[PDB]
Amino acid sequence: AYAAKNAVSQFVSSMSASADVLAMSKIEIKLSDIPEGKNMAFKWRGKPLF
Amino acid sequence: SHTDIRVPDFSDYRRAEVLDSTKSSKESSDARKGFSYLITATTTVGV
Amino acid sequence: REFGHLTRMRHVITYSLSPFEQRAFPHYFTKGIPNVLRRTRACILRVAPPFVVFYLVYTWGTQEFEKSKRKNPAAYEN
Amino acid sequence: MTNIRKSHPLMKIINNAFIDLPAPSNISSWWNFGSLLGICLILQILTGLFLAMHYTSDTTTAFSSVTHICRDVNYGWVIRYLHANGASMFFICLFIHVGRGLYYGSYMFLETWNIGVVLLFTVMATAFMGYVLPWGQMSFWGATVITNLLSAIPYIGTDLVEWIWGGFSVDKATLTRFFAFHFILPFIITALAAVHLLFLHETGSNNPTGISSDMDKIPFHPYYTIKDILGALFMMLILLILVLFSPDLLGDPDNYTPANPLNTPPHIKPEWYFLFAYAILRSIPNKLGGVLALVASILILILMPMLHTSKQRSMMFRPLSQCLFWMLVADLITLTWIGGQPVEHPFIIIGQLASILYFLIILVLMPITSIIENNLLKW
Amino acid sequence: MTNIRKSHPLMKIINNAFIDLPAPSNISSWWNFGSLLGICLILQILTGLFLAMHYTSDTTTAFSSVTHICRDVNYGWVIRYLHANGASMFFICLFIHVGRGLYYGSYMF
Amino acid sequence: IWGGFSVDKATLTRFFAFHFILPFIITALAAVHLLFLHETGSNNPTGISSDMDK
Amino acid sequence: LVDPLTTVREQCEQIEKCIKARERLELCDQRVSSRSQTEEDCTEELFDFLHARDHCVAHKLFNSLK
Amino acid sequence: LSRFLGPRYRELARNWIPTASMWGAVGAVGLVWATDWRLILDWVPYINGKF
Amino acid sequence: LELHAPSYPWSHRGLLSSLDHTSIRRGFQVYKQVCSSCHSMDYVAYRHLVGVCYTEEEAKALAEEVEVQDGPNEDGEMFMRPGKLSDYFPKPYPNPEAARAANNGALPPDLSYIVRARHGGEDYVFSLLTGYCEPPTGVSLREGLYFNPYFPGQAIAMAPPIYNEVLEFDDGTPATMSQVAKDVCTFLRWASEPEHDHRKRMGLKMLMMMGLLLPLVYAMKRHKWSVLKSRKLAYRPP
Amino acid sequence: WLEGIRKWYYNAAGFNKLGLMRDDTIYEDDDVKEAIRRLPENLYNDRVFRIKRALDLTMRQQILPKEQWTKYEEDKFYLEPYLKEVIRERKEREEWAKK
Amino acid sequence: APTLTARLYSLLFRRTSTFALTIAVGALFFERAFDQGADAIYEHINQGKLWKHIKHKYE
Ligand code: HEC
Ligand code: HEM
């Protein structure tokens, strides 16, 4: 049972998010670039950010 | 009771060549089989 | 379920003519067309009405949606 | 000596399965849709394997790979559109097959029916994942919405959704996972089909009359073989008409613009086959309720055998049940139409009414009407 | 009544295959290498399926994808080296089974 | 087989598809293999029929 | 260089469907222009005119084109 | 259904209920352990040494 | 509100008809001289033109006319080269954001699949190309936006690009706005479906072959089943 | 009144058109199979021939001539007593099993 | 007199080996006849709209 738990956990976590993907969790947005009155959009978490 | 039964008539379906009851089917056998196998052969060519 | 012992049947006589000595298409049109009309007459009473309702709903739905998109003059009146 | 067809083990299995299988003489064209499903599965497997020889699953190269298949590969367009339209043909034949099972009371073969429901789920999953593979705008956003539906599950929810996504949203990991799963699933479908055929052979085949046909049985090889070949030729006629004459008839045009995560397409709709479940989902406002309704839409086929209250297996001699069945078919057409159309005032109420009517017809109306029929026939 | 293991069709096949199959009492450990091959095949299928979730077949990204599996996919190295060494174990078992067949006259089947 | 004049991207993609599909064919052939084996039983190390000692 | 589309387009304006739609477009344009501060626009009426015009244009335009 | 609504079936049900409860306990422990569900394990002594 | 495009009587609309390659040739000229400064046909290459609208020598000359960057030479410096058949059509803008910045933040779409991607196909493209009209009353288009009743939103970001005599077709065809639109739309149709001609040819072949086979297979099926079809039955209880 | 609508359903259902009788069309569950095996041989042979002829008619998509259709009054429920006895015996066995 | 179908059956349909050869040889010629016939129809329908027709001008 212990061995099976280890193996199945390893495979399922292999299907989990990889380290590189987790690396891009947070972002650094340059406020100074964004002009006033413009909704400059970025890709955060692989999702559109406003 | 075996004698009592009689084969029903199939004339409506029988091909024109073998409709006649006085003609032996062997003469028209090649014609009929050729017709059917020609249908099959052309099908196989297309396939 | 092999062919030999499927069921028990008694005193049934079947006569079957060969494929080669019979026509492939006996009365395909002379008898086929009246048979199709008979089959259509019986079936159309049941199959058709449910689909007829859909055509009404499809027409009404399309008309209503177009009507909704059209402007209401009263809104811009006054 | 012995006949090699009977004696040799593999030939024995093939013989009993397809050659000398006792089959009822009266099964109509509706029964050919099973063999049509088999042919569709084989054609899809070959076509998809030949597509995969030229398809790269990276997000940077996926759409470019499909364009390479369509343009540069010799006869690649034929293969790609054969696949795309074969999926639609598969679903047409599946819907007709399940309709035949419902109409002629073939669901009484319990294990065959349940394995069929499992097969339907597997085929739907295969198609849903396969549609993502071109990585078009519609592919990306349909994947986004359909996977985001899973978030409605309480507790596990987001965890399960991100596990399937392989990240925060649909991205390269999701595309590659879907390619691998889309590859492997058809083979599982092929094995489940063998299980299905085994279970059916245990009980034979139902006839349109619904009365046991052991008295009148004919060998499959000399008759239904040529019948199934004719059905396959007709299916190839329809499918090749779709592939050649109208290659992009059943497909949304917005799948030809490369997927842009920052821009939503003008309309997000699943493929035509999923549209009825999409409409059923949209009808219920609560997210979890919508997901459960979408699942129940398919799972009600499991409950169909238990809801059979009639004393006659087939509906051939049940006119009122025939009327209800065609009402259900029209309701499914209506649900498809609603799913295609946007969520606005006229269509919302139509969709809610169609969903309620679908569930009512399957659950309450049909059993009560069957009981009334039994009373009418002095049972 | 009937035992479901002997009467239900799928269970009937499974029973006749690996439950009530009459097996010789003296088969040695050389007769386990066939089951070892079957286990290896299932393991290779599972491992390769999990590898393919991260493998891309384009030449620009093939090697980079393998490196991504090795370094970034959680426990990716376990899966990858399991596949690589399971292939070698697969061929070890194949060769041993062929040798067993030659030695004990199993080729008469 | 190369898909071109030499080994290149086309060959790599073909090999990926084939390497994916072939193991399942291997499984089917193994099923046929076990079927034929069960038809005649399993040979024992002594090489003598072991029906008495199954 | 006379553009055939211009000539074909004129021919719709003779057609009654273009005639009725154009009058409706002209009137609605007058109401919006007359109103000092109104959210109304002529787009909906404009589409009716263009839809009727283009449909007529489509049948005959390609004949001139070569 | 009415067939199984009988006193003997109630007796059989009582006979198998402790077994069913034990199997439920097995399932609960299995789930908690396999998922390492922290919500339950938090209370569990010396399993709380993890996380 | 949206305005659907009219079904123009295209030559290729026929079930067995195809594209006029004279129009395709003139269409490429429109694309090369007009809709090339903006919009990039990435998925179409000069070699594709070899058997469609220009011969191999002509295609080579056209490819040589533009200059394309090449791989790193010694010292690893990118360099321009005359161009060749294998090169795809040059992209006017280096990156999508550069294209947006050069067109009031409006990415010019890739003509390659523009027909297959936008609903209405070539009919829509033609309608929007020859649809630019005067804005109606109450509409206030933002500067840099133009009024086209066919573009979703009626606020396209490209000025009427096809005016009469915008280019000079080598074929001598009078370069009217409608003529230019038809030629370019035919070219785009070809670009979206380069297999169009072969597709219709295979459609004709399959139609005739299926018309041959289905009656023949049907005859075989009826011949085999006729044993049962004509079968008579009798009940003779003792 | 009720007999009118019942007669309507009898004509609406096509088993009279195929020459079948009502009990021929019943679904063959275990109780029905036991009832069938309990039939006297004359009734059994009549049943099998009726069903065979009906299957043949459905095969060619044809219907029996109007005069040969079964009559609503002439229809005889041959299987009803045997099936009722089978159901009653099964009910008794279930009842003994209950307690 | 032997009919045309009757002659064919004896000459080339009685034995499957001859039957198969007739299909194979027939398949070879049917392809060259159907393809040429199909293209002529397609060329006629699309006369003047194909490169082959307009190739001469630009070469
Ligand atoms: C220079 C920049 C030009 C020229 C000379 C042409 N177009 Fe194109 N176009 C351009 C931009 C910057 C935009 C953005 C407008 C928008 O956001 O929609 C467009 C628009 C189109 C569209 C519609 C895009 C869509 O909604 O999907 C099409 C189909 C299109 N343009 C094609 C086209 C054709 C066929 C032209 C001449 C024959 C043409 N354009 C001129 C950029 C520019
Ligand atoms: C890939 C999917 C499927 C395949 C390959 C398949 C194949 C087949 C085949 C070959 C038959 C033989 C009879 C016939 O062809 O009509 C059959 C019968 C049947 N199948 Fe499936 N089928 C599939 C899906 C389904 C589904 C989705 C269901 C139910 C929801 C189902 C339930 C049945 C039933 C009830 C029958 C009985 C037919 C009869 O009574 O004669 N199958 N199937």
Ligand code: HEM
């Ligand atoms: C058997 C049932 C199958 C179904 C229903 C199915 C369905 C689909 C669908 C709907 C698509 C998207 C088509 C498009 O929009 O372009 C697709 C794409 C694809 N399928 Fe399948 N497929 C099946 C089997 C397979 C198999 C066995 C493979 C094996 C490799 C495969 C490989 C692919 C590939 C590579 C693509 C992407 C290429 C493309 O989209 O044109 N498919 N499939």
Ligand code: HEM
């Ligand atoms: C992936 C590859 C293979 C798999 C999965 C496989 C599977 C099996 C299995 C499960 C058995 C029964 C267990 C046993 O007898 O030890 C077996 C036996 C056997 N296999 Fe293999 N096998 C494979 C490769 C081969 C090869 C390469 C050969 C011959 C060249 C072969 C020939 C045989 C023979 C003759 C037997 C009978 C052994 C006996 O009766 O003692 N197999 N195989």
Ligand code: HEM
């Ligand atoms: C009998 C079964 C199999 C054998 C003997 C086998 C053999 C191999 C070998 C020797 C490699 C080279 C690994 C390396 O160089 O590190 C490899 C790689 C690979 N195989 Fe398999 N394979 C099998 C099954 C599969 C299956 C079923 C799949 C997918 C469903 C698969 C997918 C892959 C992938 C993605 C790689 C790349 C791993 C890497 O780059 O290291 N394989 N295989």
